[PDB]
């Protein structure tokens, strides 16, 4: 009930959570997406996610 770092693994820590290409480029990479596409966080963050273990 107290995770670690949501956003801040890979797919986002990276890029920009499929931000840095348009999202309108693939067949579901993106619009399917839910995890990975989110759209809306991507903010350079990791405190509100990756601080200690929120």
Do not use: S, V
Not at 22 to 32: H, Q, S, T
């Amino acid at each position: 009930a107290q995770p670690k770092c949501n956003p801040n693994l890979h797919y986002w820590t990276t890029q920009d959570e499929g931000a840095a290409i348009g999202l309108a480029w693939i067949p579901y990479f993106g619009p399917a997406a839910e995890g990975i596409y989110i759209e809306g966080l991507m903010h350079n963050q990791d405190g509100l996610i990756c601080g200690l273990r929120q």
